[PDB]
Amino acid sequence: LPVTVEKPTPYTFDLGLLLANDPNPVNVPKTTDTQVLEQHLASVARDGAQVLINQLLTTTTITATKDGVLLTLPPPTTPLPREKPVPQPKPETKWQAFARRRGIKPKTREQRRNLQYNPTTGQWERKWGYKGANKRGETDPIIEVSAAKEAMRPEGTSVRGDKRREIRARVKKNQKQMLRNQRIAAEK
Amino acid sequence: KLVKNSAYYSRFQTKFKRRRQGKTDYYARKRLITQAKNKYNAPKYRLVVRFTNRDIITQMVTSEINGDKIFAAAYSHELRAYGINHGLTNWAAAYATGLLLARRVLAKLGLDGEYTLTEAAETEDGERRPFKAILDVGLARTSTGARVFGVMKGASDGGIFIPHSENRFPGYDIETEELDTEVLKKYIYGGHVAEYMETLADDDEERYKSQFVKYIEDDVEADSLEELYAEAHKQIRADPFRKYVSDAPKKSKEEWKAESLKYKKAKLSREERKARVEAKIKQLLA
Amino acid sequence: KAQNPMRELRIQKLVLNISVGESGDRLTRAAKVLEQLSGQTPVYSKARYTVRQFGIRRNEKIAVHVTVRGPKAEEILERGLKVKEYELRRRNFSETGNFGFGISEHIDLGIKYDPSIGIYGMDFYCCMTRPGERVAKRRRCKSRIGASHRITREETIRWFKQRFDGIVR
Amino acid sequence: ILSVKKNPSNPLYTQLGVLTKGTIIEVNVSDLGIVTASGKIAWGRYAQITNNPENDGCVNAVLLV
Amino acid sequence: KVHAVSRLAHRIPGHGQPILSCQFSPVSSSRLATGSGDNTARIWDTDSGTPKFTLKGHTGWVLGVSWSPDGKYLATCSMDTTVRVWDPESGKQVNQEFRGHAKWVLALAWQPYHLWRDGTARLASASKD
Amino acid sequence: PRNARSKRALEKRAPKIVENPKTCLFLRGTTCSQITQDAMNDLYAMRQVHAKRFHKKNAIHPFEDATSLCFFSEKNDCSLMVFGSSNKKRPHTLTFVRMFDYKVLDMLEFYLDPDTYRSISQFKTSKIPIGMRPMMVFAGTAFESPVPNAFTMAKSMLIDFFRGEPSDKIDVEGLRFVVVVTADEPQKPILRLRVYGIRTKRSGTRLPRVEVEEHGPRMDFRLGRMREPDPAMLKEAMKKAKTPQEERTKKNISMDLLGDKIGRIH
RNA sequence: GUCCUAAGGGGGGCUCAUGGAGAACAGAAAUCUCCAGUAGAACAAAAGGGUAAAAGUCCCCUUGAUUUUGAUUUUCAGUGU
RNA sequence: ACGUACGACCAUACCCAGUGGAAAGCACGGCAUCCCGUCCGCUCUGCCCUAGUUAAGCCACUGAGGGCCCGGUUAGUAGUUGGGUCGGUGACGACCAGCGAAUCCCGGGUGUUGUACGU
């Protein structure tokens, strides 16, 4: 018994999706006999599966690894629609446009690290974040206070929250700028 | 107010049947069966380990769409064929059950006409790959010295590739990150149970007799457990498919069908239900 | 079927509670009282919500309790009923079969007075169960205790009568 | 020498590739025969220069292991 | 047909010093002998990956282990100028240690089983002297 | 997206150069026959890993309004939908609906033949493991029509349904189930969906002999109502993104077998 | 105005708001015990079907605060490792 | 047919109560040396499978009250698109069609099923 079939029009294959297209007509018998109908359908299915396994075992590279015997498949060729549009570059923000105009180069990853060496303590510390350098002295035992600055200081406030106040102001300004950028990008 | 009203019963959404029965952790099951590092379309096997009061159940399971399939199964009550009649739920019996399942899997695979596509596409530089499966403990707590790891240790010694570490074996020391293989050997050959028998025979004779009445009745001393378990391992590795018959009553399948149908209570039909409804209506009228 | 040995009433757990309501030295002394009375380390309980009237805040340790099982629970319950002269009220018993009471001083129970500690009162709560309560507590195949297996108020009162020889009013 | 990873004094010195004391460089360790846990061959590692090449005429380094 | 080993079966600790020699039993792979620099040799049951015996008595690094061709004896040669013969099924030393080498004993060679005569076995030990 | 988990969900639902495997939502209308529910169960069993199922009744007519379908695509991140319906004109209908950018790309109705439908449980054979992608065979003359029609779009939707996950390698043991769709040009032609298991037998030759055994389900459809995509949306869906690992060929620049960049002079 | 071995990740255990019945102070509201509790709590988003041996809440480990390589994609580079 | 272990549908399976259960298996159970974990060996973990017991879990049957699931009817009907095609200057009134409900009502039901090992 053979393992190769003969048809007037040859099969076409897409081994990326494990797909076989048989353009020959399926001569379905014009009867109501279910078992011979399913026999003919199973014969067509058997022919398609046979030629598909033959193509996989012949035109694909076979590699035996510890996982098992693998066939290397080509990338798929049958066109199928995407579920989402192809991503596009985001619209340039105000800073990105200004840097492109002024030739401002992006900072390197080593340069933008959250780490610096404090000489006076002789230790390594963070510039920002938890226990960062931007909040230096909020937990210090003794803080020098200027007399004029303390006189101009409002009642109830202390020197220990001035750095947090400046951080809140800078965060508010950065947040307003990024909200403006998001609104402009939404309009665009 | 009544919380269990018509709105509550209509809005109520039942869980899965096995979750209601408290037998399946579906959150862990989904990651066990539908998650793979590689997408090579390969079948996956799991060693399912379960424990009862009197038995240990070990199965080799694949997951299909209409229900799971059992490739091979081993039970702790089958160790009576290999000479173990007492302590069928201890850690050594867990090891023996896992070893028996591993040997049965290898014997079924032939690693101890129709043919495979692997043999069809095998190349010249091809070697035999070990059989691989993942451990399924279910709802059991995976602590140090648990018997699910004894089953897994027995199967891995028997020849099934189960990916695992050694920090949950009995004898592992957590601060030194080392495993005491003397304690592991003692647990494999049942030295913990033997030490328990000696300690009870020295301290509390009555508790010794009550706990090990079957051991004294069958004349199984503490010092014979190591040689007994090694001897049982030798026959497990020799003949993994040895038939064992129990002391339960033996009948054929049709005889058991008749015996259970004799004790079935039949469901009453529509005519009987209508007759009972009419009788209840007549009783209410009278 | 009520004569089955598996339906025998027994003490599941006795819970000893002291709610001082204020964190600090009083709570630590109550914890030490619980430790010396039971033999095991107690449990500190935190306040769930904020109540300005009671002077408590959220996540503040205000109470302490110990759960005791076995014959030690029976001994402590015997001491408590010796304090309460084996007399209880029908209000004390619940419909779930559990009961409880409370004492005003730990000294009369059998502990010598220490001026460094002081005087503390306690709440005793006894929970009753029949054999078969593992079904509703075990991790695998947890289910519901059957209706016939549940312990009623009359059953636990009758058990209290026949066991502690007490009176209910 | 494969590359200069970090000159401790200045990123400009790191970019220019200056070999001084304390400099972290990347070295080819094929001859040392280092195999990773996965079976891969480690052929590039980090070394710290422990001498002054400008005064000594040679570069001496210690592997960071 | 022998299939290629592809994975770790068992990693068994127990030796306090680097292992200098290893050899399986000729009967089967279930018994393995390792002689190490901790002045000892060890017999391992490899089916369960467990130790079985610890042969002690040498005062130097056990430079060689060698099973008898019938498998009933194990010979260990060490840096203490001695060769010891052990019963592997009991872990006990047979007779006394062999004396007469001036320096380090480096290699052992059992006589083949078909050449044994006079109701005894012969063992050749090659030494640094 | 304050939390890292919500950020992970947003990044997973974000558009990508290479897309995630498409998710299929199985849902039914107010009227849905038991045959249609069994067919939906069989299709879910075929596609368990990348599907979600609704369990309530939805008063939605898909060819009249699809705003609720767009909302469900937005919420569940599902790009395929199988919608069950029943009616006097159409007794058992499966509406295959494909999205693009959370809007309806195309729609196609299948009418089930009820007297010939066989469930998976009615075949007493070994079944497909969970997570295994089956191979596909499309047979007949109805799939190579020069004009895009209902049969071509049905072929595209069935390919996208039984596509599974893409893979550059496959184990030879994962070539054991085949899904065959047969349809012929012509009164209405019948699209027949069958699933078979594959047995291999020695034939005295290196190539094995393939033998089939019926796995189920057995489905017969008549193609029904038809919603073609918008042209611009169709080109936007058929745009093929380029992987960053796919290099652009430069003139007279190549890479040799050792990885050195090589220039060509003339 | 204060406090934090930071967030995050992984694994394990537990079930919430509320109602009823009880327990010296304790009395609508403190704590504890049982029963019933589709989530009616909490966490995110803005469901027309989010989450219950969890996506909630407590324990253990990491906390290393933005790793390495790339002949590949985009942009840039008179300081092109 | 019954039981157990993994399961597929995920209430026809859920909420409440009563009755029965041969065989075996589950399960309740007994003891805390070792492994292990808690305030508490309650849970988890280890050891025993001997002894008690079907009381509960589990299974089957029944009973109400709910809930839930099918099929017909509603009904090709309301409603919505169409001068669509006839009159009406037009708007619209019929007719022709395409899509197409739900309430009410009637009848039935209160779980099927795969693998493996046993009774």
Swiss-Prot record, chain A:
GO terms for cellular component: nucleus. Keywords: Nucleus, Ribosome biogenesis. It is found in: Nucleus. Transmembrane segments: none annotated. Its main location: nucleus. Residues 72-93 are annotated as: Disordered. Pfam families: RRS1. GO terms for biological process: ribosome biogenesis. InterPro entries: Ribosom_reg. Coiled coil: none annotated. Belongs to the RRS1 family. Component of a hexameric 5S RNP precursor complex, composed of 5S RNA, RRS1, RPF2, RPL5, RPL11 and SYO1; this complex acts as a precursor for ribosome assembly. Involved in ribosomal large subunit assembly. This is Ribosome biogenesis regulatory protein homolog.
Curated annotation (Swiss-Prot), chain C:
GO terms for cellular component: ribonucleoprotein complex; ribosome. It comes from the Eukaryota. Pfam families: Ribosomal_L5, Ribosomal_L5_C. Keywords: Ribonucleoprotein, Ribosomal protein. The keyword Ribosomal protein applies. The keyword NAD does not apply. Component of the ribosome, a large ribonucleoprotein complex responsible for the synthesis of proteins in the cell. The small ribosomal subunit (SSU) binds messenger RNAs (mRNAs) and translates the encoded message by selecting cognate aminoacyl-transfer RNA (tRNA) molecules. The large subunit (LSU) contains the ribosomal catalytic site termed the peptidyl transferase center (PTC), which catalyzes the formation of peptide bonds, thereby polymerizing the amino acids delivered by tRNAs into a polypeptide chain. Component of a hexameric 5S RNP precursor complex, composed of 5S RNA, RRS1, RPF2, RPL5, RPL11 and SYO1; this complex acts as a precursor for ribosome assembly. Belongs to the universal ribosomal protein uL5 family. PANTHER family: 60S RIBOSOMAL PROTEIN L11-RELATED. This is Large ribosomal subunit protein uL5. The lineage of its organism: Eukaryota, Fungi, Dikarya, Ascomycota, Pezizomycotina.
From Swiss-Prot, chain E:
It comes from the Eukaryota. Its main location: nucleus. One of its GO terms (biological process) is ribosomal large subunit assembly. GO terms for cellular component: nucleolus. WD repeats lie at residues 14-54, 57-96, 100-129. The keyword Kinase does not apply. It is found in: Nucleus, Nucleolus. Keywords: Nucleus, Repeat, Ribosome biogenesis, WD repeat. Belongs to the NLE1/RSA4 family. Associates with the pre-60S ribosomal particle. Interacts (via WD repeats) with uL18. Interacts (via UBL domain) with MDN1 (via VWFA/MIDAS domain). Interacts (via WD repeats) with NSA2. Involved in ribosome biogenesis. Required for processing and efficient intra-nuclear transport of pre-60S ribosomal subunits. Interacts with the AAA-ATPase Midasin, which is essential for the ATP-dependent dissociation of a group of nonribosomal factors from the pre-60S particle. This is Ribosome assembly protein 4. It comes from Chaetomium thermophilum (strain DSM 1495 / CBS 144.50 / IMI 039719) (Thermochaetoides thermophila).
Curated annotation (Swiss-Prot), chain F:
Its main location: nucleus. One of its GO terms (cellular component) is nucleolus. The keyword Nucleus applies. It is found in: Nucleus, Nucleolus. Residues 22-232 form the Brix domain. GO terms for biological process: maturation of LSU-rRNA from tricistronic rRNA transcript (SSU-rRNA, 5.8S rRNA, LSU-rRNA); ribosomal large subunit assembly. Coiled coil: none annotated. The keyword Flavoprotein does not apply. Transmembrane segments: none annotated. GO terms for molecular function: rRNA binding. Keywords: Nucleus. Component of a hexameric 5S RNP precursor complex, composed of 5S RNA, RRS1, RPF2, RPL5, RPL11 and SYO1; this complex acts as a precursor for ribosome assembly. Belongs to the RPF2 family. Involved in ribosomal large subunit assembly. This is Ribosome production factor 2 homolog. It comes from Chaetomium thermophilum (strain DSM 1495 / CBS 144.50 / IMI 039719).
